[PDB]
Point group: C7
Chain length 276, copies 7
């Protein structure tokens, strides 16, 4: 009996609280906002599916506990029958059958699509809008956290690898479903890795965009230095144009290279019912 | 009952409006026009096939709803039969069979072939004809949009992955047809990617052609600078010839490298009828 | 009935008129002439086989139309039988069997072999004989056209991919033969590509030969410049010899590298007869 | 009989005492501490599992000895029976069946997770905190020892490769379980190699971090040299900033590149019971 | 009947006269002579086997014609029988069986082995002996011709690809033997390619040997220039020695690198007899 | 009979005396000593196993000779029986069965493990301790000898490849066991190669260690040259330190790169008994 | 009958006399002598096995001739029987069975092992001992000859590829054994190639050794030039030492790189007996 309960406790091992949310700092770029919304919604779906997973972890626990509960009812009847036979009391009762319990529901969230064509931005406009925010440290730590959670899910799969001293049909069925939950949590670990990589692709391009896009300090240089003589003004407008071209170029590379693939987790294997 | 209706609603999820048309700006080049016509006709076929797809999405919805409608008729008869048996009224009626509903038709459009031999163009002719149009931003955004729609079709396939609590022959058949529509929409996503790539091949060559083909500013240079002394005039005609050779060379590379493969989408899997 | 006729019309879709002939301009080189004759004869065989193909396209059309004609005869008899049974006229007639129609013949053309050993040519001889012709633009456009026709045959295969609402043995047989004609036209598209590539190998070597073979302008230089002093005349003959060696070298490379493989198309799948 | 005992002695061959613990010296870095805790806990699990392994080595010994003990009981009865038959004493006794003995329990230890986001450190802070500890010699020798223990486990597997002159069902079963223990010890040798490699990945990054991270001697240089004139002070703050950036950069590389995979050993194959 | 005769004519298509013989010009080198003898004997065997091939081409023709002849005898008897039955003349005759005709014999030629060790030659000896002959143009054109004959045999295989309107056992057997002759002629085309390549290996080394071996003009230089002062005579003998070493070196490379593999053609598939 | 004896002699072919022992000269390095002990113990096991191999070579000889001896007993009885039947003496005797003979025992030697952490050595300490010994010529010749013995064992396998004119069950069994001994000796040849390679890995590192480790002559230079002025003494201690670092570095590389894998030979296939 | 005799003659085709012996000139090097002895003994075994091969070639000839002889006896009896039946003489005789003839024996030669450790040689000692012999021309021509004999054996296999007009069990058996002898001679051709390659490995190292080992002319230079002043004598001994080191180095490379693999030919397939 207790062996079932020990394993029920194992599959109830509290999942470590998952990674935190993703502020992206005041980086006023449409593309950055769209990529961020996609990363956040994928993260939300993962934490929603892990909640149902936890219910299934708990259902396997509960299935072990309600198999044990149902079997507790059976054992009380068996002990009663043994006392009736030992004492020689009254007519023995006919055999029957007993079931187990229930699961969880997942929220159907929306996904964010990017613009069919990003709006054209001015040089110093974009330089300023990128300049007022950060280096992407918030996203970077999101990616870091989400990546370290690969291993926490991978570690959590290990709670479903087996059970002690339990045989019948219910035992066989539970073994299979523990293995399914084991593998599923591992899969969620892999999905964790996938999203972390997508977050890294975005962060890598954020950095690339800051490295190549004209900086606000370059805008300051354009304001402080100025070749105002007529024939030199004819060179200034090209100076501006070269930086404007770099702005367009770099924002385009960000728009393309920061593209990411949506995460679509499978539902956790529903435990099936307990055989009697 | 409602489970069928919930899934019928899922497969009715409105497809996002598809990408817009392709102006190519006043770039007066025969080759550009032919490539453009091919890209447009392929896009038209894709949106035509997606309309029938949407009808099939709706037919799977409708098949679920008319399976449910037909079954609604069955359940009303069943409930009536139960009331007749409970009350002890009149003779029970003989069993029969009931079907479901219909689909959509695709337009057979023409496809555009290129010239068997492009016409020879003069240097400044071609320079001017390319110069008066744009950089291919319209086509580039077509390619961008069409490429982002890969993922919207890929996302839309997910509405056909399953159903809740429905068993019989009709249920089995619908599952298979939902999977077929799922995979087909995914295929259309892949065709979206294919066309976007063909549009990119054209756009890449458009850019290459502008980078290598003598520019109208080079024509301006040929008009403003002119080595008019006799023995130097004997060098001017070679200056002209070198640019004329580059014109021919580059237009030839455009003619070849901007070639593209026609898109030929398969029809959406027609849902088959509902079993009774 | 009409469904058969609609598909019969589809397989009658006029094949675009095939590419034009190959003048090679007055480039008086034996090797060029032999390569050209081989390319022309292969092109002739392809257009001859496509004519029988068109007859088979038409025979599949005609097979659909004469299946329909034969079935028209059957349906008139069936309708007549129904009127006889409805009215109660005279004795019903015994069942029988009805066939369909015919095909096309291909011309057995000769193929041209090259010389077992090309004749030795003089420097200025060969320079002049190459100089009087063109750059191979005619052949280049042949290759271009023949290559664009790959896609027109590949497009034409699509007219044989299917049929609507027709079942029996004749229907099954026609489906198979439509697929065979489909694939065959595709094969002809591939043969089109093959010949275009062989034409390109010849054109590439033509260009290479003009780039490396001493030009007639080099002959003009040899006539205008001349180191006539005795000990310098002893250097002139080596000048001549070096160009003569280049002539021999380059013509040899043309002779080898412009070699091409003969095209040998398979006959179009003959449609088999209509079952009754 | 003795052959069983000789092999029982073989599988009792004392396992060499395993590698020692891992002090990491006063290197006050959170990341170093977390990596160290993970390496230590993996080492503890390996030595815990090897203790149960040793019990199973001893159980195979004991299984051979208690098979021999049980068989000793059998042989005493057999000899007694032979004396009864030789002398012609009393009625022979009925045959029965005899079993064997028991195993070991493994401690369920906790595993250490790293921080979701490491804390930002100051230049000279981190330089000092790394500077006060060592070169990682303790960890390096841990890795060395743990790696040399690969071969001691690999050597210890060889004690379970076979047995002499023993046939029945018990013999067959023991052979299989000796092979399982053989292979398991080899597996533990491989796990030894795995952990040694993870320790090496940490040590390699420790060294890399010391090579690239600004040293305390660089901090001494920053304190001793100082361009105190106003416009040069405007360069000093950048000097500081460049080293601060290197500090951040290098600690980040340590945080990432010193990441390691947890070791999760399988339990030693439990010997099954002795057949009679 | 005529269909058999049409195909009999096809397989009689005259094989183009094969390539000519191989003079090697007065290049007095033992190695050159041995390589040449091997190439010639392989060529002779190929033309001998092609003669039997032509007999088998003719036998397939003849087998078609004598199947037709034998069948001609059968048809005359059949027509006679029909006239006897139509008129009602005399007793019908018993059925029997009729055969067909014969083939060709190949000459068993000797093959030439090279010397077990080539004789040592003097510098100017070898220079002169190579100098008096040509550049290997004769061999080069042999190789050219033999190589162009690959395609003539490959073309000739096509005459054996099929037959029109002929069914029975004899027809089936002939089809198989036509395919065998088809493939065999193709094989002979491949053997043609093989020998051409061996001839090319020899020709390539001939050229290499002339490029590296001291030329007779180098011998002329050694005779015209001569550092006759005592201590310079001590340098002249080394000048001689260096060229003598190059002579030995180069002749050795020719001896090795011009080695070639003997051609050993299979006999043409003998047509088997005609079934009645 | 004699055929068995001829083959018995073949399998008795004296194995060449195996390679000699491994002095490592007075190179006072712990690591060198440990590597040497491992190489020696592996060599001892190989020569111990080859002694049992030789017993099995001799047992196959002996099995052939005692099969022949046992058969000699059989043939004497057969000849006796023939004389009894020819003469008509007395009652024939009943048939029976006869066996063959025995094998060899291998010494269970200890294996040497390396230190869990090598002791830190001083610069000139280690330089001197390496300096007083040799270049590893003794080990090098051990490796040489052991490697040439690969081929002597490989040659010795050939004595077990077959037998002449011997049929029955005993013959079949012996053939199989000769093949097993053949292959085993080959395996021992491969083990010879393995150890030679391990000895070479050690010797290669010995050389590397002498090439990179500061030499005693470098110590002599450190004693003879000495920048004794105060501020130069501040450079001398760094001179010392650089060499001390090289000492540590190089000894560490020796410790790692001279690591080797223990040899573990399989026992020679025991010949099984002779069938009668 | 004659067809058997024609093929018997074919398999008797005289094998070309094999390559000659290997003098190695007075190159007084132990290693050279050992390598030479190994090459010679392998060559001897090959020519010994080819002699038995020739006996088997002759036995296949003889088997064809003694099958024919035995069949000659059969045919004389058959003809006699036919005359007895034609004339009506006396009682026909009972059928029986007739066999065929015999083979050859191979010499069991010794093989030469190299020294377990080559003796240390002095600089000028070794220089002189190499200097007094040749360039390895004798060995080189051995390798050349042995290599050209690859093709003579490969050519000789062709005499065993088939037979004309012979059917029964004996015919089938002979066909198989001719194919076995065919393939075996080919194998011997491959063994010829193998030994030639081993001879080439030795010759290549001989040359390498002469190129790198100090020459006797270098010894002459050491005797003629001599920096006799005290402090320069301290440089002379190093001059000597550098050449002595090169001597040791190069002789070691010869000792290793000139190592070769012994050739071990299989016996020629013994023809089996003729069936009657």
């Amino acid at each position: 009996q207790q062996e079932i309960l020990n394993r029920a406790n194992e599959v109830e091992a509290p999942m470590a609280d998952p990674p935190t949310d993703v502020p992206i700092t005041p980086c006023e770029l449409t593309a950055a906002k769209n990529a961020a919304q996609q990363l956040v919604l994928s993260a939300d779906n993962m934490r929603e599916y892990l909640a149902a997973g936890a219910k299934e972890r708990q259902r396997l626990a509960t299935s072990l506990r309600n198999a044990a509960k149902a079997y507790g009812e059976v054992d009380e009847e068996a002990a009663t029958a043994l006392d009736n036979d030992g004492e020689g009391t009254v007519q023995a009762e006919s055999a029957g059958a007993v079931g187990g319990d229930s699961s969880a529901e997942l929220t159907d969230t929306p996904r964010v699509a990017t613009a069919g064509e990003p709006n054209f931005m001015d040089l110093k406009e974009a330089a300023r809008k990128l300049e007022t925010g950060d280096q992407g440290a918030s996203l970077a730590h999101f990616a870091d956290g989400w990546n370290t959670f690969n291993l926490t899910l991978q570690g959590d799969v290990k709670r479903f690898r087996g059970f002690d001293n339990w045989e019948g049909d219910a035992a066989t069925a539970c073994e299979a479903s523990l293995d399914q939950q084991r593998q599923w949590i591992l899969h969620m670990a892999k999905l964790s890795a996938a999203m972390a990589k997508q977050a890294q692709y975005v962060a890598q391009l954020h950095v690339w965009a800051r490295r190549e896009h004209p900086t606000y300090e370059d805008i300051v240089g354009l304001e402080r230095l100025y070749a105002e003589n007529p024939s030199a003004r004819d060179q200034i407008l090209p100076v501006y144009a070269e930086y404007q071209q770099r702005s367009e170029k770099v924002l385009t590379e960000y728009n393309n290279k920061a593209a990411l693939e949506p995460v679509n987790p499978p539902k956790p294997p529903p435990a099936i019912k307990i055989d009697p």
